[PDB]
Each structure stands twice: as C-alpha cells, then as structure tokens.
Write a protein that binds this DNA or RNA. Structure first.
Ligand SMILES: Nc1nc(C[C@H]2C[C@H](O)[C@@H](COP(=O)(O)OP(=O)(O)OP(=O)(O)O)O2)c(NC=O)c(=O)[nH]1
Ligand SMILES: [Ca+2]
Ligand SMILES: [Ca+2]
Ligand code: NA
Ligand code: NA
Ligand code: NA
Ligand code: NA
Length: 322
DNA sequence: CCGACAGCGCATCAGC
DNA sequence: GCTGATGCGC
DNA sequence: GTCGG
C-alpha cells in the first residue's frame, strides 16, 4: 500500500538471496525489513526515515534512497537481466525444487516448465506433483472454499473415529478472507507423549476423493493435494495444498496455538511468557526455576489454559495478527 | 568485531 | 541392509 | 543484512 514499491523491491531481493545466493539469513533479513515497512503508517520519504525501524539497517536505507530518487534499483535490474538468476528463481517456484535443485537443473540446461516436463525422469515424486499442479498451487483459496474444505475434513475424520479432534489452523483460523493452503492439526486421546492414526484419516480422505495426491507422508506428518468436488456443469475447482499433522493430545493445544500464529503474535506471546517465568514452545509450556531451568511441562487442556498460566487475557484467533 | 539468525518430519543420497 | 547428512517446505 | 552480546 503506502510503501508497496519498497516492499516489492525488498521481497525481490529476499527471493534472490534465498534462491540464487543460497543465503537464507539475508532472505530472512530482507523479509523482516519488508514486513516492518509494510506495517509502517506513513509513506516513507527517506532511507534515514526507514532505518529507524527494527530490521532496516544501512544497506536497505541506501537501497530505499536509490529507489525513492530513481524509481528503480540497479542491483535488481542487473539481477533481472541475468538469465541464470532468473531461470533459477523461476524453477524454485515448483514445490520440491529448492535453490539447490534449481541450480542443478539450470547448470544442465533445464530451465523451463517444458524442460521439466521433458525431463520428468529426473524429478523426484514431490517435484513431479509440484510440476503437475504448478499453477494451482500459486492460487489463493477463498474463505468460502476453506469453509467447505473444513466441513469435508471434519466430517470424514469424525466418520473414522468419533474421538479424533481435528482443528484447521493457519490464516483460516485467524479469520483471513483467503488462505494459501489448508493446515489440519489432528489428535486422538490414545496418542500421548508417553504412549495408523494418521494413515486411517488420510486413507479416508482419499476414498471420498478429497485428497488427490501425496507429496510426503509418515506417521505424524502428511503433505498432499486436495480438491473440492464440483457440480456437473461447473468448472472444476483448483487443486489445493493440504497438510495434516498428528500431534499427541497432551501437546495438542500448544500445537494449535503455535500453528495458528501469526509469527509476530507467537513471538510476542513467548516474550511475555518469559516475563512471567514460563517458556512456551510448539510442544509445551514449562515453568522457569529461579536460576532459569525449565521445569516439567504443565497440563494444557485448552488453548486458553496457556494464556491463563502467563496471566494473559485470552486472544481470539481473529485478533492474533500481533 | 563477529556469531546468530528456528528447527523439525519426511525423502533422498552418500557412505559404510 | 543400515546410519547420518542434506534438501526441502513450513 | 541486521542485530546485539
Ligand atoms: N503451516 C505450517 N506453519 C508452520 C509455522 C507456524 C507458525 C506460523 O505462525 C503459523 C502460520 O504459518 P503458515 O506458513 O502456516 O501460514 P498462514 O499464517 O497459515 O498463511 P497462509 O499459509 O498463506 O494461509 O504456522 C510450520 N513450521 C514452520 O514454519 C509448518 O511446518 N507448517
Ligand atoms: Ca498455512
Ligand atoms: Ca487447475
Ligand atoms: Na533499524
Ligand atoms: Na520450490
Ligand atoms: Na503457505
Ligand atoms: Na558477517
């Protein structure tokens, strides 16, 4: 919005650092900078102004000054005209092709979707599914479709065993008008820290032809593809990414809190937890002893139990953007 | 000045 | 056959 | 690239 030109530039530099440079911490630095700028309530007018924000340092302030004076960044222009950097960058858009495989393909003259399709033999199973659904995976999911997807998953899970608990987390649980994918957290009273559960559920979703493809799957984590059924004369829906994570029941609501997010919120809640003598991670909340030693995990029967320990007013998922 | 920067489940590969 | 390292997505 | 110890 106010600073969309700047945040595009920084996101473009981030993707380059990750995909071409293979410099994951510079990618994250650029993303962190773009996220604080996108949240700033003023149209930035200088590099110096931007450097006041956390995560923006000298180099990005100089890039902002150049962008503001000229409307472009020379570094980006050279990157965009570099065929190797652009080909590597494009290929990483396939799910399962990362910076390493992208660079490898491009070294041997494999640079286009068409090249991938003629070189299907050289792709692993995840990359093959990424290629198959290349356009669909980059489409967003309207909330009304997420709602329909929730009803299918929740119902079929219930048909396998009435005592499963399944929760759709991610941006959907925070009320987003659209989501990138579907995140399902699953548990069962029979699965604890100290004790086919996932397979049964996946198989059922396949039998009703909801789940169409499998990227990866083990005893606790399923990553795959699903699609809503359409009516006879309608256009078919896009295929969608869906993950299902089976979490032990004594860690479930810590799981739910973590996978709901958002990232900033989790961070701010973990910061506050320490301040009160507790430490939270994706699995547990533990009390901190006088010297700093983490104690045993506390009992957590609900998401609100976690806020109670750290004497926090319960935040509705709708309000967990920060 | 310089090391940290999140880290885990699953797939795949190198090595034994 | 197995283990441990690494790519990958998140 | 940015931060902080
Ligand atoms: N779905 C998912 N999320 C995470 C991270 C946690 C922490 C983050 O605050 C929360 C939301 O992350 P996610 O990438 O799922 O994005 P979301 O907020 O759902 O946006 P979108 O994916 O575009 O709908 O999930 C994972 N772990 C590490 O990133 C993971 O493996 N899968
Ligand atoms: Ca998500
Ligand atoms: Ca399609
Ligand atoms: Na700054
Ligand atoms: Na990719
Ligand atoms: Na996503
Ligand atoms: Na350095």
């Amino acid at each position: 919005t106010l600073n969309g030109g700047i945040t595009d530039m920084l996101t473009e530099l981030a993707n380059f650092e990750k995909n071409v440079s293979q410099a994951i911490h510079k990618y994250n630095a650029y993303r962190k900078a773009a996220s604080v700028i996108a949240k700033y309530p003023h149209k930035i007018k200088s590099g110096a102004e931007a450097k006041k924000l956390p995560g923006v340092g000298t180099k990005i302030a100089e890039k902002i000054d150049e962008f503001l004076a000229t409307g472009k960044l020379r570094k980006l222009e050279k990157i965009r005209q570099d065929d190797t950097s652009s080909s590597i960058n494009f290929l990483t858009r396939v799910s399962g092709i990362g910076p390493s495989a992208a660079r490898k393909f491009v070294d041997e003259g494999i640079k286009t979707l068409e090249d991938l399709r003629k070189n299907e033999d050289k792709l692993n199973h995840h990359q093959r599914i990424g290629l198959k659904y290349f356009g669909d995976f980059e489409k967003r999911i309207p909330r009304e479709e997420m709602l329909q997807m929730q009803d299918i998953v929740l119902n079929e899970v219930k048909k396998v065993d009435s005592e499963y608990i399944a929760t759709v987390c991610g941006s959907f649980r925070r009320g987003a008008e659209s989501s990138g994918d579907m995140d399902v957290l699953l548990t069962h009273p029979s699965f604890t820290s100290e004790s086919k559960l996932l397979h049964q559920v996946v198989e059922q979703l396949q039998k009703v032809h909801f789940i169409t493809d499998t990227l990866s799957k083990g005893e606790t984590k399923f990553m795959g593809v699903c699609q809503l059924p359409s009516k006879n004369d309608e256009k078919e829906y896009p295929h969608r990414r869906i993950d299902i994570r089976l979490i032990p029941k004594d860690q479930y609501y810590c799981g739910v809190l973590y996978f709901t997010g958002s990232d900033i919120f989790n961070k701010n809640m973990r910061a506050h937890a320490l301040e009160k003598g507790f430490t939270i991670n994706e699995y547990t909340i533990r009390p901190l002893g006088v010297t700093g030693v983490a104690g045993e995990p506390l009992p957590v029967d609900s998401e609100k139990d976690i806020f109670d320990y750290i004497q926090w007013k319960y935040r509705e998922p709708k309000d967990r953007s920060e």
